[PDB]
Swiss-Prot record:
Membrane topology (UniProt): Peripheral membrane protein
Organism of provenance: Homo sapiens
Regulation: Requires N-acetyl-L-glutamate (NAG) as an allosteric activator. Activated by glycerol in the absence of NAG, whereas in the presence of NAG it is inhibited by increasing concentrations of glycerol.
Predominant cellular place of this UniProt entry's protein: mitochondrion
Location of region: Anthranilate phosphoribosyltransferase homolog: 1-176
Phenotype for G922D: In CPS1D; significant decrease in protein yield and enzyme activity
Name of the molecule in the record: Carbamoyl-phosphate synthase [ammonia], mitochondrial
Phenotype upon changing L1314S: In CPS1D; significant loss of protein stability
Reactions catalysed, as given in the entry: hydrogencarbonate + NH4(+) + 2 ATP = carbamoyl phosphate + 2 ADP + phosphate + 2 H(+)
PANTHER family in the cross-refs: CARBAMOYL-PHOSPHATE SYNTHASE [AMMONIA], MITOCHONDRIAL (PTHR11405:SF53), CARBAMOYLTRANSFERASE FAMILY MEMBER (PTHR11405)
Segments forming domain MGS-like: 1288-1422
Length: 1422
């Protein structure tokens, strides 16, 4: 394929691939930061003579429209002039393949027809930074054998080259005569005039209009130095010097011509204004507007008498408008007709027409919109902020991140802050730093406790928009009850009224109907009977979605009556109102993040295109940013609707809005608005570098957007809409294999436990990184499943495609491979074909590479493979090499990635921060590598067993390094984390946590070292590979980490040290297994799974009736210098992470503690530990056995650290980098710190209702999704507070009890106790006979499998529904007889929303604790 260069006059040269007309051309090189509307854009007459450099790296997605179709006025239907006006085009990536309902050909074919050169494959960012602020960069697209000289088209009057040669009329017959002086007018100026009643006489630029009859005159244009248009400047001057008073309205060139006619100077700007995100302020009334501009000359701000500036540019203070003080003459420097751009200043046409109609020398100011809000700063001295509580599916760490930004904002403005969050693992809840509240309460986020806090703290402000639905619902309940009014607590930001209007689906409908906005046929109902009615009126299929919820709780598609019955019943256990709505499954799902301040300035900060269509929850969807398959008309229609809706709803702060867009028309539906920070705002903040929560919080104090700094640029405001010169992809992470009852299908109700975000400058690059980030077993986009699972032999590939699931991406790969047409895949998946083209490109590269080897693969091919996201591992498998070999081969050809900044403005202004990503699609680095900082690796996506605790550890380490004056480099790919907030470190790489990429970054920075022990499993598993590739690992040697993860070495070490452990053995045979299990007695663990009977694999003696103890510790040179021991409530057999933890220990013998300590002393020494680690122990009397050792921070490190008032990670970080440490006050083995006056309890969080049909029962594999912790004078109090913090609700009614027979001896007393506390008891058959035989009264109930077979017995479903039963106790074990029946009982409780207890110890402790406050850690530490 044919190449060509872009050559600039300063020597820069870049080789591109030609996609336009293969011929050379010379002009002024410029750049424009607008991301969409390339077809409209390239037909702008302002680009005459110019070589355009596109910020958007991905160009051509929608091909080109009908370029010959006219409208009924005789103007181009889809374009802004009669043809392409750029002399040439420069992009990074060209989509040869396109997909849009209005596309009639590729953009390259269009370019070829119009004889316009175009090349792709050039670093448009580098170009931009070179052009930036040089006034005039000349360049040329030069083809081989076609030399051209540099030329400056500005030496010509370009106005004349693009003006009409004779007078043309549009709106023939219309009442209002408007002369339009054509200086390169865009078509939409004409459309907007005619639509308002004008007959438009379009006249050449040198036409003598001065004695013509007209009712108004307009002057519009784009290209050229206006000073070269003397005939015209003269003519306009004659008008101004006369007595004529016809309103005059100037656009862009018009501003400059009119200024010149009046007597002002113009100048060529060194930094032009070219974009769709250019902020202007109306001087007069302080209203701000986002504008499209495309001008390189500007008016000097010194104007003659009678003329005043109207608009100013908020970035650079240049003029953007003028007005006469008494006559109806005005001009704007920007394009209110946009196309492309934001439809925010179209009112200027209405204003013009009002000047004509009033016609008595009315003034420009008198007909301009008056401010609808006047931002007065709210006075607040103390604010309460609410957290989400424990993490759960759909309500994850995004709020830790948001709420930390909010506190920072509050502190900057001298506002005292109180935080409530029982999530002890949150970074939010730390004591130290600019993001930490002055006071922290670890308590339930429920009205009972928030009231107590309010009373005690007497705050005057409340932030309820940064804790998900928990905080929202709590705040609305407080409001409804008048608690806020009662204690004088103002809701800061969006009002409870606006909130209710977005959370109640009916009120939402009412609001949008008030402004005749577009929604789908629907009815909000409050009963199952009413839902059935609604569905019959609307017609099946229908979607139901709940009020006062997020993440699709209780939602679902209903193809029929019976599905609707099942789902609405379940929905009503969790909300009071559902919306029953006509299905728009398959429409494109589009999100916007919207900001609105108290001055009524309102912008869309980000927009996201969901790759999975409507019907798969945004949260369980692949999502790209910015959008890729919208037209300017689509994108701007939805943007402007967002702004209207958000305005009408009274929202002040930030919010998220969702649309369904018809895939082949302009039809759309507004689905919901989330008037609060969200998982979507977190993502958008990371994608754009715009900190939405920080901004939201400043706005909540009445500071308007123009007065808030863009911290990234350091020189501009937050009144703008970022420009991305890269694309981000977010993919969810699911963990479903362990929940046997739950399918891996996905739909309207979230099931994902985490997410990743990758950045690239091609879809393919961004996309394959993001897939690798989700799980270490995923290599990129391949037709192979994760976890090395084989495809089923009974696979129905069409079914997989048509029914979304956690693995559909790979099923698409497979289908493309197996030669299914792209058209049929789009038809079944609903995924826009454009995205499918990219996927096919990826698989073609795989085919190509498979036919090559280390000798046969060329440099051109390798480079391309990397540019579309292939890792060295993927390549290695094609070539027949190892990964190391392939890395070597690549570097040998000097093919490496480049380091680029996110600056929010696609290089318009440089970044003062270093928020970074890495890409193969560039020709330079955006930063230096002189720091040689200390690298810290983060956790990756959250998943079960790996949550925000590992962000806590990482952030603690990052903060410790900063506090010690050390340069830091962070790598993490989780958008929800505070570790991926750029203000925490010197260099944040939002990047893959692969060996490949860490090596890339380490070696590129020449980092002084790397800390791999504070981000869980991912970084720790890289310890040895890193070691071997020249990386300096801080702390405990990777050789020691290997030794310790080697079960055989570890065990032999323990034998040497005389430290006990459970008998174990690795086996290959069933007979070895059975022999061993026989030799130690059943039960046995199996590697996870336990077995109790006869009816390679590691086997371990399962020790029954055993306590479990955690040792969390820090080593220095093999000595332990901080430690903490906690006891689980539950016996060994419940996994650590599902366990409830007590600190300090409660029932452990003092001799066992001594053994735990001695075993930890020896282990630390044997593995020369310098850093954090953990050891887990079985304890039975004085027998102390080691279960496992982890040579890294454990998930209980936050709990332990905060509880004991010592940052274990601060200590450990200082050890690892050789900083000094005073051990006097640390909890060494010799002087532990043991709380005397209080106890701490950590409880696990679960997400059973969202894991449809899952058996809510603890296995040896872990199931919890988060944690809370609370404190108390004793264990009962602390335990009750912890449990309430999980959502557990103390029963007020009857308790259902069903237990396996063997629990009877121990349970009798638990039951008597519950009875003596006054709880009416219900029980399953045998359990009820037994209780009554022991004089504990119980009412028997029927088994679910036997309902109707005995009329003396009530069904459990009915007793729950009736409200007779509001706690279920179900205690199965291995000898449970009625396995299914008891499963049904357990799942019934979950799906009815009543608490369920399935562990005996937890149940015992509960009973003891109900036998009988609002304090927190800081109380007890005093
Ligand atoms: N009318 C509909 N037809 C098909 N899918 C829908 C419809 N309405 C909503 N959805 C899907 O359900 C998801 C959840 O709906 P939403 O109204 O966003 O509730 P939540 O606040 O719980 O996320 C949406 O993102 C979308 O994928
Ligand atoms: N020998 C044993 N007897 C009884 N329970 C055990 C035994 N070993 C492990 N368990 C249980 O299984 C859980 C997981 O064991 P662990 O070795 O920590 O696995 P993981 O690799 O998932 O961390 C433990 O926390 C404990 O409750
Ligand atoms: C949970 C459990 O194991 N229940 C008992 C049933 C005892 C009863 O009849 O109440 C069982 O053996 O299935
Ligand atoms: Cl852990
Ligand atoms: K979606
Ligand atoms: K909502
Ligand atoms: K959303
Ligand atoms: K499953
Ligand atoms: K090969
Ligand atoms: Mg929502
Ligand atoms: Mg939603
Ligand atoms: Mg473990
Ligand atoms: Ni300007």
């Amino acid at each position: 394929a044919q190449t060509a260069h872009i050559v600039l006059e300063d020597g820069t040269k870049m080789k591109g691939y030609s996609f336009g007309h293969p011929s050379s051309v010379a002009g002024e090189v410029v750049f424009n930061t607008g991301l969409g509307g390339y077809p409209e854009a390239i037909t702008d007459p302002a680009y005459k003579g110019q070589i355009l450099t596109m910020a958007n790296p991905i160009i051509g997605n929608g091909g080109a429209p009908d370029t010959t179709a006219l409208d009924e006025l005789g103007l181009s239907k889809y374009l802004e002039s009669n043809g392409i006006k750029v002399s040439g085009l420069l992009v990074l990536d060209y989509s040869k393949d396109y997909n849009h309902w209005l596309a009639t050909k590729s953009l390259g074919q269009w370019l070829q027809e119009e004889k316009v050169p175009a090349i792709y494959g050039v670093d448009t960012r580098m170009l931009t930074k070179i052009i930036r602020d040089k006034g005039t960069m000349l360049g040329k697209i030069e083809f081989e054998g076609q030399p051209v000289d540099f030329v400056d088209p500005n030496k010509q009057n370009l106005i004349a080259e693009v003006s009409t040669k004779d007078v043309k009329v549009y709106g023939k017959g219309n009442p209002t005569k408007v002369v339009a002086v054509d200086c390169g007018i865009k078509n939409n100026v004409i459309r907007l005039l005619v639509k308002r009643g004008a007959e438009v006489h379009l006249v050449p630029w040198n036409h003598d209009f001065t004695k013509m009859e007209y009712d108004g005159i307009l002057i519009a244009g784009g290209p050229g130095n206006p000073a070269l248009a003397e005939p015209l400047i003269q003519n306009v001057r004659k008008i101004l010097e006369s007595d004529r008073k016809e309103p005059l309205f100037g656009i862009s060139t018009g501003n400059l011509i009119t200024g010149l006619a009046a007597g002002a100077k113009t100048y060529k700007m060194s930094m032009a204004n070219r974009g769709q995100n250019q902020p202007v302020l109306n001087i007069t009334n302080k209203q701000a507007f986002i504008t499209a501009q495309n001008h390189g000359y500007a008016l000097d701000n010194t104007l003659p008498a009678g003329w005043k500036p109207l608009f100013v540019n908020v970035n650079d203070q240049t003029n953007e408008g003028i007005m006469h003080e008494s006559k109806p003459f005005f001009a704007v420097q920007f394009h209110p007709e946009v196309t492309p751009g934001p439809i925010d200043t179209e009112y200027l046409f209405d204003s013009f027409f009002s000047l004509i109609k009033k016609g008595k020398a009315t003034t420009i100011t008198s007909v301009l919109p008056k401010p609808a809000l006047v931002a007065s700063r709210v006075e607040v001295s103390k604010v309460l902020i609410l957290g989400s509580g424990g993490l759960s599916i759909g309500q994850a760490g995004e709020f830790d991140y948001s709420g930390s930004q909010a506190v920072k904002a509050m502190k900057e403005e001298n506002v005292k802050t109180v935080l409530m969050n029982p999530n002890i693992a949150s970074v939010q809840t730390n004591e130290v730093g600019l993001k930490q509240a002055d006071t922290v309460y670890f308590l339930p986020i429920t009205p009972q406790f928030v009231t107590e806090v309010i009373k005690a703290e007497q705050p005057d402000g409340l932030i309820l928009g940064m804790g998900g639905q928990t905080a929202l619902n709590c705040g609305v309940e407080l409001f409804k009850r008048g608690v806020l009014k009662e204690y004088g607590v103002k809701v800061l930001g969006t009002s409870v009224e606006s909130i209710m209007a977005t959370e109640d689906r009916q009120l939402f409908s009412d609001k949008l109907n008030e402004i005749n906005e577009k929604i789908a046929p629907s009815f909000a109902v409050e009963s199952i009977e009413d839902a059935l009615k609604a569905a019959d009126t609307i017609g099946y299929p229908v979607m139901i979605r709940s009020a006062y919820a997020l993440g699709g709780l209780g939602s679902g598609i209903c193809p029929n009556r019976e599905t609707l019955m099942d789902l609405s019943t379940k929905a009503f256990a969790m909300t009071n109102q559902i919306l029953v709505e006509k299905s728009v499954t398959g429409w494109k799902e589009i999100e916007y993040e919207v900001v609105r301040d108290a001055d009524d300035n309102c912008v869309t900060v980000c927009n996201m295109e969901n790759v999975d269509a409507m019907g798969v929850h945004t949260g369980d969807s692949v999502v790209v940013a910015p959008a890729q398959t919208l037209s300017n008309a689509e994108f701007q229609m939805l943007r402007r609707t967002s702004i209207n809706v958000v305005r009408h709803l009274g929202i002040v702060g930030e919010c998220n809005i969702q649309f369904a867009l018809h895939p082949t028309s302009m039809e759309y539906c507004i689905i919901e608005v989330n008037a609060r920070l969200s998982r979507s705002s977190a993502l958008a903040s990371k994608a754009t570098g715009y900190p939405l929560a920080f901004i939201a919080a400043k706005i909540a104090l009445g500071i308007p957007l123009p007065e808030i700094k863009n911290v990234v640029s350091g020189k501009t405001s937050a009144c703008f809409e970022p420009s991305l010169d890269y694309m981000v992809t977010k993919i969810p992470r699911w963990d479903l294999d362990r929940f046997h009852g739950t399918s891996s299908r996905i739909g309207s109700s979230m099931k994902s436990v985490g997410e990743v975000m990758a950045i690239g400058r091609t879809f393919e690059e961004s996309f394959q990184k993001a897939l690798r980030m989700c799980h270490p077993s995923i290599e990129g986009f391949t037709p192979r499943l994760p976890m090395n699972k084989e495809w089923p032999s009974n696979l129905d590939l069409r079914k997989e495609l048509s029914e979304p699931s956690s693995t559909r991406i790979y099923a698409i790969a497979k289908a493309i491979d197996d030669n299914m047409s792209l058209d049929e895949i789009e038809k079944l998946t609903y995924i826009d074909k454009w995205f499918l083209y990219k996927m096919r490109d990826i698989l073609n590269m795989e085919k190509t590479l498979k036919g090559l080897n280390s000798e046969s693969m060329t440099e051109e091919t390798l480079k391309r493979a990397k540019e579309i996201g292939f890792s060295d591992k993927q390549i290695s498998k094609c070539l027949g090499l190892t990964e190391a070999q392939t890395r070597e081969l690549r570097l040998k050809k000097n093919i490496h990635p480049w380091v680029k900044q996110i600056d929010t403005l696609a290089a318009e202004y440089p970044s003062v921060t270093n928020y970074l990503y890495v890409t193969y699609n560039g020709q330079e680095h955006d930063v230096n590598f002189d720091d040689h900082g200390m690298m810290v690796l983060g956790c990756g996506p959250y998943h079960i067993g790996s949550s925000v605790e590992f962000d806590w550890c990482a952030v603690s380490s990052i903060r410790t390094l900063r506090q010690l004056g050390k340069k830091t480099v962070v790598v993490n790919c989780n958008p929800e984390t505070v570790s991926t907030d750029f203000d925490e470190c010197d260099k944040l790489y939002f990047e893959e946590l692969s060996l490949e990429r860490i090596l890339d970054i380490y070696h590129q920075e020449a980092c002084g070292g790397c800390i791999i022990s504070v981000g869980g499993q991912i970084p720790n598993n890289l310890a040895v590979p890193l070691y071997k590739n020249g990386v300096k690992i801080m702390g405990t040697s990777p050789l020691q980490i290997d030794r310790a993860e080697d079960r055989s070495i570890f065990s032999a070490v323990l034998d040497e040290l005389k430290v006990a452990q459970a008998p174990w053995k690795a086996v290959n045979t069933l007979n070895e297994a059975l022999e061993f299990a026989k030799s130690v007695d059943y039960p046995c663990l199996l590697r996870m799974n336990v077995v109790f009977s006869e009816d390679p694999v590691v086997l371990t003696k399962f020790v029954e009736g055993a306590r479990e103890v955690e040792m969390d510790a820090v080593g220095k040179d093999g000595r332990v210098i901080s430690h903490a021991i906690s006891e689980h409530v539950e016996d060994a057999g419940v996994h650590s992470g599902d366990a409830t933890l007590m600190l300090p220990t409660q029932t452990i013998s003092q001799g066992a503690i001594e053994k735990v300590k001695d075993a930890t002393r020896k282990i630390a020494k044997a593995f020369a530990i310098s850093g954090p680690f953990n050891v887990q122990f079985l304890v039975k009397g004085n027998d102390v056995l080691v279960i496992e050792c982890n040579l890294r921070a454990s998930r209980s490190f936050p709990f332990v650290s905060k509880t004991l008032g010592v940052d274990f990670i601060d200590v450990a970080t200082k050890v690892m980098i050789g900083e000094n440490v005073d051990e006097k006050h640390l909890p060494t083995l010799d002087h532990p710190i043991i709380p005397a006056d209080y106890v701490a309890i950590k409880a696990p969080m679960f997400s059973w209702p969202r894991l449809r049909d899952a058996d809510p029962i603890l296995r040896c594999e872990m199931a919890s999704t988060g944690e809370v912790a609370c404190f108390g004078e004793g264990i009962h109090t602390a335990f009750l507070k912890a449990m309430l913090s999980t959502g557990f609700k103390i029963p007020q009614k009857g308790i259902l009890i069903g237990i396996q027979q063997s629990f009877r001896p121990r349970f009798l007393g638990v039951a008597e106790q519950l009875h003596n506390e006054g709880f009416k008891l219900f029980a399953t058959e045998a359990t009820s006979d037994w209780l009554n035989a022991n004089n504990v009264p119980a009412t028997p109930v029927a088994w679910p499998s036997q309902e109707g077979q005995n009329p003396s017995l009530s069904s459990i479903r009915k007793l729950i529904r009736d409200g007779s039963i509001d706690l279920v106790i179900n205690l199965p074990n291995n000898n449970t007889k009625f396995v299914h029946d008891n499963y049904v009982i357990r799942r019934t409780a979950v799906d009815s929303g009543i608490p369920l207890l399935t562990n005996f110890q937890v149940t015992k402790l509960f009973a003891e604790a109900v036998q009988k406050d609002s304090k927190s850690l800081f109380h007890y530490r005093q």
